[PDB]
Enzyme design. Structure first.
Site, PDB file in Angstrom:
ATOM      1  N   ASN A 180      18.661  22.612  -1.710  1.00  0.00           N
ATOM      2  CA  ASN A 180      19.314  22.426  -2.996  1.00  0.00           C
ATOM      3  C   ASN A 180      18.513  22.955  -4.172  1.00  0.00           C
ATOM      4  N   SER A 214      31.976  20.828  -0.775  1.00  0.00           N
ATOM      5  CA  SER A 214      31.949  21.194   0.628  1.00  0.00           C
ATOM      6  C   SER A 214      33.354  21.062   1.183  1.00  0.00           C
ATOM      7  N   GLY A 246      36.562  14.511   3.267  1.00  0.00           N
ATOM      8  CA  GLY A 246      37.835  14.330   2.599  1.00  0.00           C
ATOM      9  C   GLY A 246      37.899  14.634   1.121  1.00  0.00           C
ATOM     10  N   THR A 247      36.943  14.131   0.341  1.00  0.00           N
ATOM     11  CA  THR A 247      36.931  14.376  -1.099  1.00  0.00           C
ATOM     12  C   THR A 247      36.605  15.824  -1.420  1.00  0.00           C
ATOM     13  N   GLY A 248      35.711  16.432  -0.647  1.00  0.00           N
ATOM     14  CA  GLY A 248      35.459  17.841  -0.821  1.00  0.00           C
ATOM     15  C   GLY A 248      36.560  18.734  -0.292  1.00  0.00           C
ATOM     16  N   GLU A 287      33.495  37.706 -18.062  1.00  0.00           N
ATOM     17  CA  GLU A 287      33.218  39.122 -17.871  1.00  0.00           C
ATOM     18  C   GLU A 287      32.814  39.484 -16.453  1.00  0.00           C
ATOM     19  N   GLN A 306      24.854  15.268  -4.291  1.00  0.00           N
ATOM     20  CA  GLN A 306      23.563  15.799  -3.877  1.00  0.00           C
ATOM     21  C   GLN A 306      23.233  17.104  -4.596  1.00  0.00           C
TER      22      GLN A 306
END
EC number: 3.6.5.-
Lengths: 11, 431, 44, 43, 426, 427, 431
Positions: free
Chosen positions: B220, B132, B136-138, B246, B14
């Site tokens: 977003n 996020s 699970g994947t996040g 930097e 997303q």
């Protein structure tokens, strides 16, 4: 180091 | 000068639509991929011999139905097919599903795929990771990505814009079990790491702009206005400039303390836009005013440890260097004594772009600060609050244990940030 | 312990670096004593 | 809304990458001169 | 017979390398292409101090431009006078430090010093009888300060008798853009002091104090700051290229100005600072040029000798003018300088007359001069290096290059007594 | 009066020496069919050094092309200047060497060596006074190096008073397009020691550094590398063809740079190599020719003379120029540097001035140097020979051709003494 | 004058030869009736005086059903009728039938049509042998043919492209009894040998190309793309050239150790060929990759004894030598101790041709690699299990013994290969 000291003495 | 996005989660994808729609109008890219050499784009887009410009990004999801809307969207020809990695079952608000059992099949292809979008990079500044902490994947596979990624490259750059959960409104109940077992692991496995809460962006959108009833896309938009500003000095010439190595250099005083958080300044609507003036001074007061921040953490309780400034558009180095002096005057603002100057200024000439379907007008001056603050230690105190208000009677713990895991990884990843809450404690006392 | 710790290569550098400024400091003096000698050499 | 503006935008980097995966047409030497696409900042 | 090789160092090093070479090109009639379109013949006599000859009647500067990032060298070729530089002279790294002195001084820049030192030994032994070099660098960076002191350290160990100069860009007490700038600046002044012959402090507060309070500009850029800096930097090399009644090299502006080989810190100024409404009321008399240098509203380093002594002072004058009035107006204000000068040096002022005036002018003046009101510059730097090192602020960026704490510990004490070296004349 | 019989061996040996003849023929004004169309008489008065006369005012080179397979002797004939050669001098076998040093030294190239010493004697006994031969070859192949040392080993015995120059392409340190390279080069440098008057050392890697970093070409090729070899081949032998204010033959350089008879490995270079864009800034004077002979990036060998000492130095200048200003610069470099010059020779530089410049240039310059930093080449061949030969890797491809294992053991100890020979003129 | 004579034995061998010989008629100008409508053809095609070109091919089978499609197909006029040898009853998955009982009927007759083909040949470079280890006449009679060729011709070069039986996917029960009794004829009677099993070619067509369900035609097309790229240095000219003698000089260290491994680099589809960049440094990465390898053995377990690369198209030695140095740098590969020079380079001007109805795309660069690895000693030791598993209880040995075989060959040729596994072990252990 000892050789350097000998050189300094000679100088 | 390449800068590889690595977007993990369904919030990876997303956000891998909003950022890359901005990047297909900031540089005049058609949704086929073409463009009516300029070579400002070369951090992000590639090039073939037909005049086509494929993004250097890989998207990771474990749900197969968040990416099939990308593959049949408007930009269905822009992305080369092999870059948007999907699972076959998701990980379903769980650590060890996506960390130890289900992510072992997606750890092979993305570590083969990022060794092709980093083989084309003569000088790669650093990967970016947006996730996020929630699902699970996040949480799991995103934890599992970085551990191997440290081995595969060593001391290349890893940045972390993230989606921390809000202090009151959250999608689920077992976000804290995923929110805390990443922040243990992502300590030594992250170079810089930002935070944002979605209700903090809610308090900006319908208040400061005149748009009630948003969607996540109306949120977003605003993250893309910040992901571009950090790389704004890399693709367009400036009076000064700052690259990716930097700004972290002047903002990470200790290699655990690498957690900055702040806002974007002229977030005002097109009925308040062409009616007020928006000078260089009139935007820096907003980034210092706490009601217009982009986290639900207020630095009146905290000490401005180190800062960074990102100026866009019609700024002159006089009023940039003039309202900085007025920041010093007022004692609502409190620096800590062991950081006496505190700023890094990056002045970019290119004004920011208005997106179709966006809400904000065309504005000549802007600021996106990244200030570390000791009032980020009221985040962790309100999440050990609710982990030990949920781990007290051993709730939900049977989910994670028999997923290729041991009960001991809860305790040591909870006892870990107990002393990291002392690491953010000692920098608030002066001798 | 018999295993290499996860991190330490930095310490490796730290050790040698010490030797660096170390032996460096000593030679500094040797040349320094020599310098006065030369300055005196110049005088004579 | 604003247009495709190349007034402040940067151009090809001469000193960083030195190969012909960026230049169109046939060249034989390195293009070492101060002529840019954004030569119009001064005017 | 006498050549000068000029060194830029850094992003501030290069955007000050633009307008110095702009105004020298206008001082000696050089088009943006490079050739010579001259309305005189004193404008080709001693032009070979600075410009190497080339074929076809061209003249390329003896300038070597260094930076550890290619993104602002290529803008220098993109500039107005960017086509006049032969492109071998840029020395470009891949990824520099960027507000970190340590990477440039051991890890990143310390293997770019071995590539410039081929190039500067090409532009030194191409000259017949070289007179000197010159640096202009920024202390706040990573390249001009980190690597840039490894130039001065190394280059003084191969060319020891020749002269070198620096136009230091020291950080300022309010106009700053870097947290990490004291570690950048304090850890190079000893690598500066133990080596260099001349210094000058170029603080950007002072340039803001000129354009607003005197010139009355609306939107000054650094381009309206590079001219004011480099209008002085021609003025110290003026009689190298233009004759006079009495001369002054940069060498002889030191041998009457450098008593002790660590006491070389200065504070410039410049005569004509009139707004374009006050260009109308140009009386243009020899009192007019002098009394700005005595005035505390011109000085190009944010330091004032109300707290100190005008210890040893120098004047260089431009304009075909009267040798009786050059040395009279100095004496008209020198007698009331009663607690303004020390007792143990009775004839401080070294003078010069350069006959050729600055381009578009007929008279002006310039001042550089040492003081004991410059040991208040360094303690205000190191009041904020002791307000920040006691809590180990940015230390993890610094021990990971092999730097022990003794290097920190020395270069507090290795500059605390040089401040007390400058102190006793107060 | 002073003839040179050209020899060339192999695919490396013919692709170098087919571009060298296009260089020489336009140095003397010879069209692709062979006739003379020029506007001087210095182009014609000393043309008998290289060109046999033919009928009708047509000139044919003194070159003999040997090879062990007929595929690379038809790309040479079908080039631009491929029709100038006499067709008998083309020598090719029918079965290749196969990158096998034994196969070209013992088996395949021992019946072809008898068929080329008929050709090289018809061209050597037709000269009024033979100065000396040449060779162009590579120490990585099979017919350049196997048979190509069998020629020098044989025609030193029949003609022991003449000159035998060679232009080796010894194997590169970094790039290596043959696994069986180190057995070729180790067994061949022993044959170079005894039977050769001068030998140059050319590395194809150090030709690639010139054509990218300095000449600044987008696409180099093996014609932009064979132009660099041929522009050094012409510089050594231009005081034989053109008058000067000071002359230097092929002997007068070998007399001066070769003190002891085992030490004849040199290091070429060439001064005015400038780009299109940088030509407006460059190309100025004679101090810009002594600046770029002696630059350590311009050496045609991938060994740096900063590691050791110049035993002897040479320089051949081309262009009509000042006999003072040549001599002041060689005094200038011999006096600034101390430990780059051997102690027991106090005039290490020999100089020569040739009037007629190279083609398209108004002045030019050429270098030869002799170093005790050339013995870092053999300490890197012998680190990869006895790496392989310790566990006997590719040994059946040489022993089954008629060799034995102690021909290997002597040939390493015929290199581990020339390494320790040069290490005693080190101090 | 660079002739090579092709021998195809078995239904595996014949149907491979229908794919190679349909390839070379398109690479040159030959139509299916033999007519060139116009000497690069002369290492394969002979010629009459009437403008007809006839291959130097021998097709051998013990069953009439396979060749009877060649005799009535499209190319029925390309072949002289004597070159298509057929038996009357096949060897029927049996070593003893095809070597001892049924093979002697055809060993007299095919050794006369070889002599007529090798008496038209001025410079014969060497034969090519196409067979499969599993079948009756592919293992039995090919062992009888090689045993006769080593006496008839002696020191001539003989090459064998083969099909090792695949480890798990297989179409037989008596597969290991043939495939261990054929070791001695590929140990003492072949000069080079290549073992590509069908399972690894299956993992390329479904993955690199878009052919789900590939029939055996899509497998035999890729083996023509390895034969031609080995022999296009013989027919079409090049910047550098290698003959058949020149790579086995540079690839075969010891005479027991003649088993290399083949790979062809761009296997891409015209769906995706719009997207990839396809340089010379990009394809040489992919010959080295354990997914594109053509037998199911992984050379990251083993030490690279030598290499031999073969580049076609628009390739310059600058680009060849630039990417060789990248291959050297990565410690994911590991050369053997005593091969420090390493490689071998062949640069050929001719781009690889395009077959219509085929599968690949029209490219301008390619690589074919033949490398020799200690990690071939897992392929035979996987089959060492499945033979002695089945031979322990003496199954199926009654078929072989009654067909003119003594039973000692089962306990000798098992130890004829049991030395070669410990032989490959010691020639990869460091000094």
């Amino acid at each position: 180091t000892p050789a350097c000291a000998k050189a300094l003495f000679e100088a | 000068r390449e800068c590889i996005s690595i977007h993990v989660g369904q919030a990876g994808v997303q956000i891998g639509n909003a950022c890359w729609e901005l990047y297909c109008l900031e540089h005049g890219i058609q949704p086929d991929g073409q463009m009516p050499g300029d070579d400002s784009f070369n951090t992000f887009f590639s090039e073939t011999g037909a005049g086509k410009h494929v993004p250097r990004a890989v998207f990771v999801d474990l749900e197969p139905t968040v990416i099939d809307e990308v593959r049949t969207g408007t930009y269905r020809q822009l992305f080369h097919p092999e870059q948007l990695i999907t699972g076959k079952e998701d990980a379903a608000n769980n650590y060890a599903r996506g960390h130890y059992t289900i992510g072992k099949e997606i750890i092979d292809l993305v570590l083969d795929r990022i060794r092709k979008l980093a083989d084309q990079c003569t000088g790669l500044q650093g990967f970016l990771v947006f996730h996020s902490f929630g699902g699970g994947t996040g949480s799991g596979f995103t934890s599992l990505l970085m551990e191997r990624l440290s081995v595969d490259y060593g001391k290349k750059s890893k940045l972390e814009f993230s989606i921390y959960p809000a202090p009151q409104v959250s999608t689920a109940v077992v976000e804290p079990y995923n929110s805390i077992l990443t922040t243990h692991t992502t300590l030594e496995h992250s170079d810089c790491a930002f935070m944002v809460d979605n209700e903090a962006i809610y308090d900006i959108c319908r208040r400061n702009l005149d748009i009630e009833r948003p969607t996540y896309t109306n949120l977003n938009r605003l993250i893309g206005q910040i992901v571009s500003s950090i790389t704004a000095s890399l693709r367009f010439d400036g009076a000064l400039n700052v690259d990716l190595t930097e700004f972290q250099t002047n903002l990470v005083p200790y290699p655990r303390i690498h957690f900055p958080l702040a806002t974007y300044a002229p977030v005002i609507s097109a009925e308040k836009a062409y009616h007020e003036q928006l000078s260089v001074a009139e935007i820096t007061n907003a980034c210092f005013e706490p009601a217009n921040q982009m986290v639900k953490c207020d630095p009146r309780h905290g000490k401005y440890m180190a800062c960074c400034l990102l100026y866009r558009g019609d700024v002159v180095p006089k009023d940039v260097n003039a309202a900085i002096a007025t920041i010093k005057t007022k004692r609502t603002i409190q620096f800590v004594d062991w950081c006496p100057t505190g700023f890094k200024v990056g002045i970019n000439y290119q004004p920011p772009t208005v997106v179709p379907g966006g809400d904000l007008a065309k504005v000549q001056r802007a600021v996106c600060m990244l200030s570390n603050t000791t009032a980020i230690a009221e985040a962790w105190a309100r999440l050990d609050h609710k982990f030990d208000l949920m781990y007290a009677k051993r709730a939900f713990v049977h989910w994670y244990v028999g997923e290729g895991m041991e009960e001991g990884e809860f305790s040591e990843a909870r006892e870990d940030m107990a002393a990291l809450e002392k690491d953010y404690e000692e920098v608030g006392v002066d001798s | 312990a018999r295993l290499p710790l996860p991190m330490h290569r930095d310490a490796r550098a730290q050790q040698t670096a010490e030797v660096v400024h170390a032996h460096a400091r000593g030679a500094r003096l040797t040349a320094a004593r020599l310098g006065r000698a030369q300055h005196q050499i110049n005088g004579q | 809304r604003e247009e495709y503006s190349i007034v402040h935008r940067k151009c090809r980097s001469q000193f960083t990458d030195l190969n012909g995966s960026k230049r169109l047409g046939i060249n034989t030497w390195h293009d070492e001169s101060g002529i840019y696409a954004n030569s119009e900042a001064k005017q | 017979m006498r050549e000068i090789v000029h060194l830029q160092a850094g992003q501030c090093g290069n955007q000050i390398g633009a307008k110095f070479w702009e105004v020298i090109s206008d001082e000696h009639g050089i088009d943006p292409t490079g050739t010579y379109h001259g309305d005189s013949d004193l404008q080709l006599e001693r032009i070979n101090v600075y410009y190497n000859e080339a074929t076809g009647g061209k003249y390329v500067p003896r300038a070597v431009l260094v930076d550890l990032e290619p993104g602002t060298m290529d803008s220098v070729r993109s500039g107005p006078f960017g086509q006049i530089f032969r492109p071998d002279n840029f020395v470009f790294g891949q990824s520099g430090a960027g507000n970190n002195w340590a990477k440039g001084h051991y890890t990143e820049g310390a293997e770019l010093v071995d590539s410039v030192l081929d190039v500067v030994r090409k532009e030194a032994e191409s000259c017949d009888c070289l007179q000197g070099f010159q640096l202009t660098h920024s202390l706040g960076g990573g390249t001009g300060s980190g690597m840039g002191t490894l130039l001065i350290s190394k280059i003084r160990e191969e060319y020891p008798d020749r002269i070198m100069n620096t136009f230091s860009v020291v950080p300022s007490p309010k106009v700053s853009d870097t947290v990490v700038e004291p570690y950048n600046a304090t850890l190079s002044v000893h690598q500066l002091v133990e080596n260099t012959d001349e210094t000058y402090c170029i603080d950007n507060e002072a340039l803001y104090d000129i354009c607003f309070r005197t010139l009355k500009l609306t939107t000054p850029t650094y381009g309206d700051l590079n001219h004011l800096v480099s209008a002085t930097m021609s003025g110290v090399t003026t009689c190298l290229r233009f004759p006079g009644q009495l001369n002054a090299d940069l060498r002889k502006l030191a041998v009457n100005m450098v008593p002790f080989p660590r006491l070389h810190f200065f504070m410039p100024g410049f005569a004509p600072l009139t707004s374009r409404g006050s260009q109308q009321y140009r009386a243009l008399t020899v009192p007019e040029l002098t009394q700005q240098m005595f005035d505390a509203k011109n000085m190009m380093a944010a330091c004032d000798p109300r707290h100190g002594r005008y210890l040893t002072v120098a004047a260089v004058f431009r304009g075909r003018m009267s040798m009786k009035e050059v040395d009279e107006q100095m004496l008209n204000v020198q007698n009331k300088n009663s607690s303004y000068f020390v007792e143990w040096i009775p004839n401080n002022v070294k003078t010069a007359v350069c006959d050729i005036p600055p381009r578009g002018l007929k008279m002006s003046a310039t001042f550089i001069g040492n003081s004991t009101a410059i040991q208040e510059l360094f303690k205000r730097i190191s009041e904020q290096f002791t307000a920040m090192f006691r809590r180990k602020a940015f230390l993890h960026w610094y021990t990971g290059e092999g730097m022990d704490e003794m290097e920190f510990t020395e270069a507090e004490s290795n500059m605390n007594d040089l401040v007390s070296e400058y102190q006793q004349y107060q």
